[PDB]
Amino acid sequence: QPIKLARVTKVLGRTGSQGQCTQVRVEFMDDTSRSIIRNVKGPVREGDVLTLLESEREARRL
Amino acid sequence: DIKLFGKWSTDDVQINDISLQDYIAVKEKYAKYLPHSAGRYAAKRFRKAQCPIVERLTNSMMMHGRNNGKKLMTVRIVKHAFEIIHLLTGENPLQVLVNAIINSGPREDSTRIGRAGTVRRQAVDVSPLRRVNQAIWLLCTGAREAAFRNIKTIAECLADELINAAKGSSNSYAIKKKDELERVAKSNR
Amino acid sequence: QSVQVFGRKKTATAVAHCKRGNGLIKVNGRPLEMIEPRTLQYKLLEPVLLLGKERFAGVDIRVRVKGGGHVAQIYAIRQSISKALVAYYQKYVDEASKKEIKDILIQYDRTLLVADPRRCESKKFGGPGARARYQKSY
Amino acid sequence: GRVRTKTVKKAARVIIEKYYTRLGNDFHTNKRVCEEIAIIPSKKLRNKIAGYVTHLMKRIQRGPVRGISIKLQEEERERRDNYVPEVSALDQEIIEVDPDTKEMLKLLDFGSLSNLQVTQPTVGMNFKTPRG
Amino acid sequence: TEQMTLRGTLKGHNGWVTQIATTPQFPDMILSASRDKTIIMWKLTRDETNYGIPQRALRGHSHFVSDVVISSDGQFALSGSWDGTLRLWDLTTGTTTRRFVGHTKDVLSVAFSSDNRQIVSGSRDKTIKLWNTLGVCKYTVQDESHSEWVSCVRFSPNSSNPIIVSCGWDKLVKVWNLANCKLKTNHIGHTGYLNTVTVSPDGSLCASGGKDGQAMLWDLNEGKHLYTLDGGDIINALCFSPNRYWLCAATGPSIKIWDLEGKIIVDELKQEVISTSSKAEPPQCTSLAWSADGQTLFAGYTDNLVRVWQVTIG
Amino acid sequence: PVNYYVDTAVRHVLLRQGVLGIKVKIMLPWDPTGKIGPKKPLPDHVSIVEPKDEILPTTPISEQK
RNA sequence: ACGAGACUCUGGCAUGCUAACUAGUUACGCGACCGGUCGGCGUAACUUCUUAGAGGGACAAGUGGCGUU
């Protein structure tokens, strides 16, 4: 279960039942050729970094 | 001077996160001596973020209503056990502190999804601020329960709790409940 | 000789009169570093540890503090001291020294030159606290 | 939470539509001229009106505004549209004409014009979009 | 015909620069008015590091200081505020020795008599007021005066009788003489409001300007039209050269320097900042002035920084 | 404005069948110079003085006195 | 057009102004300490903290981006 970092490029929106997740696009550093969509819990920002425990998992988009 | 409390070195701080340092960082000119500048940080989103970690963590001491708003006790209780920690450990009351919090904050949580989802949840990444705030509360709750009906007093539970968190031991309530929540999330992936 | 620039914190206030003298500072007709709590002594001492003692070795400042609340009495002493030095230097000696001291303190702390806008909100009826209301019956 | 009520917007529109010459781009001057030439019963209302007037001045400089209409703008725009190219975009040396319009012109006795180049019609008959 | 090149900029203030006051008798004192409610001194060093740090800052105005003029001696300054007051600053202790209250609204531009004994002030109260150095009220021109704001009014600093020229937002200028203060000459032709007027220290030219973009030259001894010096919009500052033959007008962001002989340009001072992300118009200079030697130009902008231009020597 | 722009009057009519309540609200008009109504306008009312029509000058035309 | 907003009251700024010997700086035995803290005094400068009046001040106003610009 490797841990890697990816830079936020565009905060897509806020989702959740009562609303607690920020769906955001992150571009990997070490590749810069692949980007993914992740729903981060808690107050997140634009351009910062996020620690993912799984790179093969993506949350629902739109 | 520029050191914390005039004794804690300001120059031997380590990045130790490569790019997560922007939310855990005490290296700038704003890093003041006594962590007491009133409650103007909880007035706008992320105006708390620029606050140094020591200040927010000593702020998070006052719970349970009986000791609400007793920031003098909090700063004294942090100065004590800081003058202890490094002493018993040896590093820098700071570096140990950042390591302890980084080790005590969860990194993956479980949230419900959908308009009518009521059976399953999904794993989600945790943002720096959320984990740090939660971890500080966990550390404070562990200190409170080690000072509640126990042979240990205040300004001392924090020291050994931080030492355990830096060590990565299961003794501290913080990382043990972090592992419990992580196991719940892993079963909920 | 006298600037009487004052300084505010809650309803409490502090007035720091600055004059040409030995450089020693007095607060409430007392020396500086013996305040009874001894908890926020460095908080009010920040100007010396920031701008250096030489900048504080050419001005005699007598500070008087009046206002309800002990934590309100403090947090205005240091702002009054900084404002007193700024006003004294601007009025008497030159601009550049006050410019450097104000720039350094502001890059360190913004609150040392401007007063606090916070104040105690009124209490509206129907509840025990300011915003809180009484417990509903359901 | 800084949306302007129709009182402020309408007053600013009227002031800008009548007194364009006097006002400028600096809020601290628009407020003074507005309080000079208008009865504004409140300082805050005058500040709001002058701020929206300054915003409208920043709006007009980049182009005519939909809600703003004075004669000066009309004359300035008719000056702007007083643009004529050197060569007419219409008449050139050779213009393509299809055989059918060539027959139409020869019916009108204008089919002997030499500016006309008889181009060939479309190769096929595919001009309807597929249905479904 | 000489290129006008920036030498060393100055920053460190929290407001626009609204007036620069320069004296020809001392080569070091030069005043600055700034709508941070202050007046600033400068000590020019002419070196590469910085153009120097200001020496003294004077704070006495409840609102912005509009225009400041110096006397024949550099130890006394006269500053009018937007609050309708005037202050006589003495530099020996950094305080104001006198404050005069004759107006009720913002005094736009202030002037001084040739011998520095009269104080003539104009405000948006649609009136002009002439006092002595003691502050005793002498003359108040209200009847058959400007029907609008009086934006600027200055004396005629020549050996002849002092003569006042006042420009207003009524698109008309009016000229009077101190002997009786009676209406003699009204100048028309402007189709817009006049902001600032300046007369050369010979009583022979009088240039106005404003949003119209055209500067009108008036002869003090004649009072008739001479020629039109067209330029950019918003002529805020007009100033002649004491040691040369240059009239500089800050027509919008740019500065146009004309000659009283051929009435043609000397150098178009083009300013531009190169950036891939830029959607804001360049800052506009508000005040122009010459030094005592008349060879370096000070330009107070809306950018909270005064731009100082030397002659290229070539 | 209801403090000075509106006058309120409540009264009772006594009748054999009952009592009638009568409430009256009047709005005074903008009446300066006489104080029958308020001397100040409604705070939301902005009035603009009409532009004056004058001959736009072409050349400086002054006359000696 | 009413309601909303504006508006009235309240606070965050006034070294600009009118000012008091009820609250008070700055002012020499008197009450004293090997040049310094001390609500016991009196007129002077006439207002900075003190009270309340005229005003002024903030307007998403100035920049960066998003926006059917």
- Tell me the resolution in Å: 2.7
Q: Does F46 touch chain D (CB under 8 A)?
A: yes
* Choices 3.40.50.2000, 3.90.220.20, 3.90.1010.10, 3.30.230.10: CATH for C1-138: 3.30.230.10
Query: How far is Cα B104 from Cα B106, in angstroms, rounded to an integer?
Result: 7
Residue B106 CA, chain-centre distance (Å), reads 12
CB contact (8 A) between residue E225 and residue F59? yes
CB-based contact A42 B23, cutoff 8 Å: no
Residues with Cβ < 8 Å from E313, sequence gap 6 or more? E2
Q: What are phi and psi of B126, to 5 degrees?
A: -105, 135
CA distance E65 to E81: 4
φ, ψ at C58 (rounded to 5°): -145, 15
CA E197 to chain centroid, in Å, comes to 8
Residue F57: φ, ψ to 5°? -70, 155
Amino acid E314 reads G
Give whole-number Cα distances, D1 to D4, D45, E263, in Å: 9, 16, 53
Tell me the two tokens of residue E31. 């005043």
| Interchain contact, F49 vs D11, CB within 8 Å | no
Domain of B182 in residue numbering reads as 4-187
* Chain C interface, best mutation among E53, E90, E91, by max C CB count within 10 A: E53
Q: What is the CA radius of gyration of chain A?
A: 11
D7: DSSP letter: H
Express the helix, strand and coil content of chain A in percent, nearest 5 each.
0, 50, 50
Q: What is the CATH number of the domain that holds D57?
A: 1.10.60.20
CA of D67 vs C1' of G5, distance in Å? 22
DSSP secondary structure code for residue E244 in this structure: S
Please state the CATH superfamily assignment of the domain spanning residues E7-314 in this structure.
YVTN repeat-like/Quinoprotein amine dehydrogenase (2.130.10.10)
Determine F/A contact with 3+ CB pairs under 8 A as the test. Answer: no
CB contact under 8 A, C107 and B29: yes
Length of chain D: 132
Nucleotides of G under 7 A from a protein CB: 2, 4-8, 10-17, 25-26, 35-38, 48-50, 55-65
Contacts of C21 (CB under 8 A, 6+ apart): C59, C60
Nearest C-alpha neighbor of B163 from the set B97, B105, B94 = B97
Cβ contact D56:D16 at 8 Å: yes
With 0-12 / 13-18 / 19 or more C-beta atoms within 10 angstroms meaning exposed / middle / buried, residue D94 is exposed
CB atoms within 10 A of CB D28: 15
Question: In this structure, are strands E30-34 and F6-15 parallel, antiparallel, or unpaired?
Answer: unpaired
Q: Which chain E residues contact residue D21 at CB under 8 A?
A: 192-193, 211
CB contacts, 8 Å: B75 with chain C: 39
| Start-end of H helices in chain F | 2-5
Are C75 and B72 in contact (CB < 8 Å)?
Answer: no
Closest CA relative to residue E258, chosen from E245, E269, E271, E277: E245
- Test E187 with F57 for CB contact under 8 angstroms: no
Q: What is the CA D31 to C1' G6 distance in angstroms?
A: 17
Question: Residues of C numbered 59-78 whose beta carbons fall under 8 angstroms of chain B's beta carbons: which are they?
Answer: 75
Structure token pair of residue B111: 């949230």
Angle ∠(A19,A23,A24) on CA atoms, nearest 5: 150
Residues of chain A positioned with their CB less than 8 A from the CB of B188: none
List the subunits that have 3+ CB pairs under 8 angstroms with E.
Answer: C, D, F
Distance CA E67, CA E154 (A): 12
The Cα D7–Cα D1 span in angstroms is 16
Distance, in Å, from the CA atom of C89 to the CA atom of C93, rounded to the nearest integer, reads 5
Distance D20 CA to G5 C1' (A): 27
Method used to solve the structure: cryo-EM
Which strands make up the sheet holding E246-251, listed edge to edge?
E235-240, E246-251, E256-259
Instruction: Provide the shortest C-alpha distance from residue F60 to chain D (in Å).
Output: 20
**B137 within 8 A of B165, measured Cβ to Cβ:** no
What residues of chain A, 15 to 34, have a C-beta less than 8 Å from chain B?
A: 15-17, 20-22
Give the span between the Cα atoms of E106 and E128, in whole angstroms.
Answer: 12
**CB within 8 A of C32, min separation 6: which ones?**
C25, C26, C44, C45
Q: Are E80 and E32 in contact (CB under 8 A)?
A: no
B135 SS3 class: helix
Opening angle at CA B6, ends B1 and B9, nearest 5: 90
3-state secondary structure of B173: helix
Among left, alpha and beta (phi > 0; psi -120 to 50; other), residue B165 is alpha
Q: What is the 3-state secondary structure (H, E, C) of C57-118?
A: CCCEEEEEEECCCHHHHCCCHHHHHHHHHHHHHHHHHCCHHHHHHHHHHHHHCHHHCCCCCC
> Nearest Cβ partner of D21 from E124, E192, E234?
E192
| Cα–Cα dist E22/E8, whole Å | 18
Q: What is the CATH number of the domain that holds B83?
A: 1.10.455.10
What is the rounded CA–CA span in Å between residue E273 and residue E253? 13
The domains of chain E are located at: 7-314
Looking at the complex, report in whole angstroms how far the Cα of residue E261 sits from the nearest Cα belonging to chain F: 22
Degrees to nearest 5, angle at CA C97 with C95 and C103: 95
Helix (H) or strand (E) holding B93: helix B93-104
CB atoms within 10 A of CB A24: 26
Tokens of A3: 């841990």
CB E18 within 8 A of CB E44: no
DSSP for B19-61, please give it: TSTTTS---STT--SSS---S-STTSTTTTTTS-HHHHHHHTT
Q: What SS3 class is residue B128?
A: helix
Q: Distance between CA E20 and CA C24 in Å, rounded? A: 41
Identity of the amino acid at F10: V
Interface test mutation site (partner E, options F54, F62, F63, max chain E beta carbons within 10 A): F62
- Are F2 and F42 contacting, i.e. CB atoms less than 8 angstroms apart? no
Structure tokens at B156: 């001392």
Q: Using the CA of C17, give the nucleotide whose C1' is nearest.
A: G25
> Computed from CA positions of residues E52, E53, E57, E61, in that sequence, does the dihedral angle turn out positive or negative?
positive
Domain with D57 in it:
1-61
Separation in Å, CA of B114 to nearest CA in chain C: 32
Distance of CA B117 to the CA centre of its chain: 33
Amino acid residing at A58: E
- C41 phi, psi to nearest 5 deg: -65, -45
* Nearest in space to E100 (alpha carbons), one of E80, E114, E122: E80
With CA of D27 and C1' of each nucleotide, the nearest comes out as G61
Residues constituting chain E: 314
Å from the C88 CA to the G46 C1': 22
Mutate to test the interface with F, among D4, D6, D13, D19 (most CBs of F within 10 A): D19
Q: Give me the residue spans of the domains in chain C.
A: 1-138
